[PDB]
């Protein structure tokens, strides 16, 4: 028999929600998704279509604060058995009211609603036509909006939040005198939602500010007293730097839980993961633990994973609200993978996408690079980091002491690791035109000149109007677009000295050049330390020597690498010796110091977006404290608070968006915020990661391309006035 | 027409209630009577059928606390115009939330319900069947129960009152730890009311006490905190003594209200009421004022009476909640004329009911006395103050010093004003049997002996089991039952001296004896000072002069007064000379000190109950002061709280009922409270009014007869446990 709802579950892409009622699954009306009774438990199944057409499942069970143990028990039981019915391939999530995951919150753009009552109280999700209602909702949140039913009284109020007095046919939105316009904008979406989803469009919504309360409101609440200040410390976040985690091994029936340390500090090795066991990725310091199930683990402890996680949270004395995710071997999520050195799937060198696809990007089309059509697609710009083809007008300066000195035009494309340069580029991309200032910092540039280049960069931006895009690039991690500014020649980077008045230092004895190519066909030749154990099967290298030139071409190489590899030889003034990987003369091996171990890690080209999906966060340095809050769901322009500083974390680059009305001391710390963000990432990513500062209204193509609903005129009119113009119309 | 709802108004006995909605009268569902929204105004019409078949109208308009001036204005307009439609024969009342008059409150025994909202907020009474409810009701009140809708939060609770969590199909009644069993009983009525009148009996109600809150309750309220004490500022009723009042004349062209004093202190003279004007009886101290309208007052001033009342209240600086009643000349009520000394009706000496019948006794059937069936009816006992025919066993003692001296059996029936007596009597009334102790105190008895008689009276009551009825009577104000103790012989009372040993005193040469008869037929001859201006046409008189003895029989006299007067002559051993009112020989007049004024006014031997309806109150001395609270509506055994001291005030006598669980000080102070009650009465009634102390479970026939549903077993089982059996069943 197995239960009738299971037969409807996960049959096609979408969202399904059931409430557990007396050990039974009862469908919640689709128009009411987002509403959860505080004393109930729910089961939420999200189905996504992977790129190969296969279906992916995210199973969450939600627990209200006033929820008992028999109900939450029934929920955990259903999650387990439902996962089994779906062939144990679902990722499982335990969500607790007020602390649910970003994945979960992303499913409700309109926001969440916490209602008083539940099954034990005889309440149900029902919105008949003729209905009598008298409830008060307190709206809180900037990135994730939560509307909680509170007692209908002045005592529930404060002057900082917005409240909604729902009287049925009349919906009164009230916002405190100290409420921010963005918050009121959000409050309005909840009110509109009630009008449209409940009531079905047949209801009047009127918005009011403190001090202008209507008669209706005054009638049921009574005369307005003096109001309190909002308690910002409701759940004030202060998770500055939390990048550490531990890996445990577990084996238990459900009671005799044996836990043993396996890794005291991430990055963890993918090897520590054994298919015969279950592991617990402990990231509790950031309120989240992962339970990993090996594909050959016993059925008894597989079906006890949820309980196991609980016992772990107890024995570790963690808050009950800790976030829990259980993943099956082979179906690991990006958030889990990020904790390991170099995660390589032994069945993903081919195929389409990965075994998992983050919900917030499942709807994004993967557009391949096409130089000829690039200027007509912001999506392409964003996916390949190319604001334009790179053939626009540019100026290149070297920093000498404290001044900008023009670089000899004939030298363009050539850079010396002993200096720091600044580049002004004018880009043209149909939809937009602008400038980009690149600040390149050579690994051997002296501190004073590096510091001087940053300042000169900021000053150029300012004497240009504060309109340009500002990007900080470090030698070694040059971004794709910077690479394509030199016709078809690879960007050459000598780890050598300067190139000013007179360097004379460069033509050493044995130099090695690594030629890496980008999605846009762009290439760059970088000099490193001559050693076998530094080669890469993908890109192609060039080994200079007093004998001859070795044009080593790795098996994983291609057109772009080779072509660019040799164009370097012409510059170096030498004749190569095309040598294919594996079969290379021992003459080559000696010009490195032996013959160590290669590096055959296949670059996640297309799979890049899948393994490291982009994430959007909000920045706050307020009171010497650095805090970041992620904004869930599909990226929307509406989420960009003009008084905030946002971070669009691409994997290959970090964008920092600064709102027109943010504070001066925060837009000045833009770059610093990005660095703090990057030095804090649990993934322990390269600190050289390029950083790009964008200004509201002058966002580049590779930025907007990530937002499908992008409209330049969006800020021509105050969004809140726009919103207000819809309700009362 | 004037209004289609006016056509349905007061056509037959009953209660009609309209809610004022946007200047219109909208009928309230009868099963919801008692329910009132705080932001609205209402019009209530009580129609009582008089004894002569005619209809009587009590028109009230009730104003909620969050009610607007226009809605309240509309209600007053409708009251005035509805009175006009009813040919201005109605008595109008202004009722304010929380301070309604006893008359109004008497229409709702189950209690009053103050709901949140009103027309401005879009609320209605007419509510569909399938409805989703979630409300909290706070119930306060001992005599009059008021349940107020409050926010659904623990913040609304206290450990003293009871609260009802109305969740629809289930009603949860919670009572604080410090709640009285009587209050719980009262709260239970509201719960059953909600289940029966709302929900159509289709609901479950559970009763719980603090500490045992159920799951459904904790689910919507959250965990229970530590609750506060209840504010005992019930009202403080700081009006221990309010017997003073003033009478003003109010002449106003329209707005210029000219107020002028016409009677500084009450009693007032009925002749002060001139049909050409409007008067204001001021009893603000006790929170009430009446406006009297002359039958020949200007139409422009009658239709302005309500406004005139308001202006008076603001001018005199009284509280806005002050109760206001406006009545028409000829349509006065008992509470109004009680302020006037000797009130008379033009053409009512012939009839039944002085044009006004108090709602709480409208259903009581008048039953004429009949010794043959007395023992068969408690109603007859109560209405005639006869616990039985008075042929029971008795013992009479005269108090001498500190001792009870048995009276000479052959003297039984003769009382001397210089003594005090104690009479122990055994009554037999089909329904029950018991004992009564009469303490007769003579007007010329010395303080020590008067004092000693009270103590000995209370002492006898105690050593007899605290079971007898205890009655204090003063010479000249003998109660009917006491007069019947002496066979057919009348109770002879000489203002004389003593009947003890050495006591030759008071043998005056000329003596006058007024021979009165009671509705029951008993009679008493009271020695009065010999003056013509002391005669009364209603009863017979005996004049004893040294020369002769006269038997003066007034025109109103009956066979009862004559037989009593001659039975007296017989005791004085004098041969009578009968004379009839009208032909008084000059010897008669010259003996009385010369002919003088008279007193031929007839008595209320039937309309007595109409002119002075019985009233029930509760007593207390909370903070050293004396407070009385009236219990509205029809007298009911359930309103007799076993831990209270009640006053059943007929006009003839004052019954003081002592609950078995009242404080020792309270039942020891019974008599004092009663006297205190009489000394404070506005009516300025005789300070000699008999007082009768009654004990719980031993109430005499003349007391229980006032309660139409008396059950002698009612206290066998605790009422709360009894009632808890009707709801939890």
Curated annotation (Swiss-Prot), chains A, B:
**Binding-site residues for Ca(2+) 7, renumbered to this chain:** 538-539, 561
Which parts of the sequence carry Phosphothreonine? 689
Q: Where does Ca(2+) 3 bind?
A: 160-161, 183, 233
Localization annotation: Cytoplasm, Cytoskeleton
> Where is the segment annotated Actin-binding, Ca-sensitive?
381-729
Q: Which residues carry this modification: N6-acetyllysine?
A: 531
Q: Where are the transmembrane segments?
A: none
| PANTHER family, per database record | GELSOLIN (PTHR11977:SF29), VILLIN (PTHR11977)
Family listed: Belongs to the villin/gelsolin family.
Q: What is this protein called?
A: Gelsolin
Native species: Equus caballus
Q: Lineage of the native species?
A: Eukaryota, Metazoa, Chordata, Craniata, Vertebrata
């Amino acid at each position: 028999v197995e239960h009738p709802e299971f037969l409807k579950a996960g049959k096609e892409p979408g969202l399904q929600i059931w409430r557990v009622e007396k050990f039974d699954l009862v469908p919640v009306p689709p128009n009411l998704y987002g509403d959860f009774f505080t004393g109930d438990a729910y089961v939420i199944l999200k189905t996504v279509q992977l790129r190969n057409g296969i279906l992916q499942y995210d199973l969450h069970y939600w627990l209200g604060n006033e929820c008992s143990q028999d109900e939450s028990g029934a929920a955990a039981i259903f999650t387990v058995q439902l996962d089994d019915y779906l062939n144990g391939r679902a990722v499982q999530h335990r969500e607790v009211q007020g602390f649910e995951s970003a994945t979960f919150l992303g499913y409700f753009k309109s926001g969440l609603k916490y209602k008083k009552g539940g099954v034990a109280s005889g309440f149900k999700h029902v919105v008949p036509n003729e209905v009598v209602v008298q409830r008060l909702l307190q709206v809180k949140g900037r990135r994730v909006v939560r509307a909680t039913e509170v007692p209908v009284s002045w005592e529930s109020f404060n002057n900082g939040d917005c409240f909604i007095l729902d009287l049925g046919n009349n919906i009164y939105q009230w916002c405190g005198s100290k409420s921010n316009r963005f918050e009121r904008l959000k409050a309005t979406q909840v009110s509109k939602g009630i009008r449209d989803n409940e009531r079905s469009g047949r209801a009047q919504v009127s918005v009011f500010e403190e001090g202008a309360e209507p008669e209706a409101m005054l009638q049921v609440l009574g005369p307005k007293p003096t109001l309190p200040e909002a308690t910002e410390d409701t759940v004030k976040e202060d998770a500055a730097n939390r990048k550490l985690a531990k890996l445990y091994k577990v084996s238990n029936g459900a009671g005799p839980m044996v836990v043993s340390l396996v890794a005291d500090e991430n990055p963890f090795a993918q090897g520590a993961l054994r298919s015969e066991d279950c592991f617990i990725l402990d990231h509790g310091k950031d309120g989240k633990i992962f339970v990993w199930k090996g594909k050959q683990a016993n059925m008894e402890e597989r079906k006890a994973a949820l309980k196991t996680a609980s016992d772990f949270i107890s024995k570790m004395d963690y808050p009950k609200q800790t976030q829990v995710s259980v993943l099956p071997e082979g179906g690991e999520t990006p958030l889990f993978r990020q904790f390991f050195k170099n995660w390589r799937d032994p069945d993903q060198t081919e195929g389409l996408g990965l075994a998992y696809l983050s919900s917030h990007i499942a709807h994004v089309e993967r557009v391949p690079f096409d130089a000829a059509t690039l200027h007509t697609s912001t999506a392409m710009a964003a996916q390949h980091g190319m604001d334009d083809d790179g053939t626009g007008q540019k100026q290149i300066w070297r920093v000498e002491g404290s001044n900008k000195v023009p670089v000899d035009p004939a030298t363009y494309g050539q850079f010396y690791g002993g200096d720091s340069y600044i580049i002004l580029y004018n880009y043209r991309h149909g939809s937009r035109q602008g400038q980009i200032i690149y600040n390149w910092q050579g690994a051997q540039s002296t501190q004073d000149e590096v510091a001087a280049s940053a300042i000169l960069t900021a000053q150029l931006d300012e004497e240009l109007g504060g309109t340009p895009v500002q990007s900080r690039v470090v030698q070694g991690k040059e971004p794709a677009h910077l690479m394509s500014l030199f016709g078809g020649k690879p960007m050459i980077v000598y780890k050598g000295g300067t190139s000013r008045e007179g360097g004379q230092t460069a033509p050493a004895s044995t130099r090695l050049f690594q030629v890496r190519a980008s999605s846009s066909g762009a290439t760059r030749a970088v000099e490193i330390i001559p050693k076998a154990g530094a080669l890469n099967s993908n890109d192609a290298f060039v080994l200079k020597t007093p004998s001859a030139a070795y044009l080593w071409v790795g098996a994983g190489a291609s057109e772009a690498e080779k072509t660019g590899a040799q164009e370097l030889l012409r510059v170096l003034r030498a004749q190569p010796v095309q040598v294919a990987e594996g079969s290379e003369p021992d003459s080559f091996w000696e010009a490195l110091g032996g013959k160590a171990t290669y590096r055959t890690s296949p670059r996640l080209k297309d799979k890049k977006m899948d393994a490291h999906p982009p994430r959007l966060f909000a920045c706050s340095n307020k009171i010497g404290r650095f805090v970041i809050e992620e904004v869930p769901g599909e990226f929307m322009q509406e989420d960009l608070a003009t008084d905030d500083v946002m971070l669009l974390d691409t994997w290959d680059q970090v964008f920092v968006w600064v709102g027109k009305d943010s504070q001066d001391e925060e837009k000045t710390e833009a770059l610093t915020s990005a660095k703090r963000y990057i030095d804090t990432d649990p993934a322990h990513r390269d600190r050289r990661t390029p950083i790009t500062v964008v200004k509201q209204g002058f966002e580049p193509p590779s930025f907007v391309g990530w937002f499908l609903g992008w409209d330049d005129s969006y800020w021509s009119v105050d969004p809140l006035d726009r919103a207000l113009a819809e309700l009362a119309a």
